[PDB]
Amino acid sequence: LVCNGDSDCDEDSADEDRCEDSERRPSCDIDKPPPNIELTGNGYNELTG
Amino acid sequence: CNFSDKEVEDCVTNRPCRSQVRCEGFVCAQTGRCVNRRLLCNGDNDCGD
Numbered sequence: 001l002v003c004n005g006d007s008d009c010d011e012d013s014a015d016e017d018r019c020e021d022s023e024r025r026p027s028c029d030i031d032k033p034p035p036n037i038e039l040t041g042n043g044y045n046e047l048t049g
Numbered sequence: 050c051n052f053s054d055k056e057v058e059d060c061v062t063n064r065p066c067r068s069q070v071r072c073e074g075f076v077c078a079q080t081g082r083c084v085n086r087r088l089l090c091n092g093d094n095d096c097g098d
Contacts, residue, residue: 017087
């Protein structure tokens with residue numbers, strides 16, 4: 001996943017540090033995730049809901 | 050009231066102090082912000098300057 005064209009480290013992006021764009025290849029046609037997929041990653045509190 | 054509820058006097062340097070907090074990173078010369086060397090040549094002003 002290092003030097004790959006995706007930020008596979010999430011908060012850091014150190015895998016994409018110091019990477020030549022001539023060495024990169026297009027990882028995918030697109031980058032756009034589904035419209036609110038981040039909500040699927042939230043925790044949940046069962047009491048408060 | 051007078052705004053000067055604060056007042057200040059200068060002194061001699063009676064004693065040293067250890068304020069010289071060690072930065073292992075790069076020191077943003079004008080700001081003194083300590084930034085990680087991976088943020089050099091980042092394409093982004095991660096310094097102030």
